[PDB]
Amino acid sequence: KPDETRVKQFLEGFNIETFEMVGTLSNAQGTFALVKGAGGVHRVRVGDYLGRNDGKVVGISEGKIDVIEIVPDGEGNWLERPRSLTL
Secondary structure (H helix, E strand, O other): OOOOOOOOOHHHHOOHHHOEEEEEEEEOOEEEEEEEEOOEEEEEOEOEEEOOOOEEEEEEEOOEEEEEEEEEOOOOOEEEEEEEEEO
């Protein structure tokens, strides 16, 4: 199930397929995917969201960000769907 409590993030105002993985960044605050989209390059960590379908960032490897989106069944349940952004 989607989390209706949380506040959607900036990058959830945009279509996921418009985004590009342009690399990865690691520093004292952890590991971030570099996601080029919505007018600049964003530092995105696991658990952050991308796109309009509750796309949770679940994997960040050199050259691919794994996302799992959650969309309704129509049937009162929810289905998980992968999205990938590759470098």
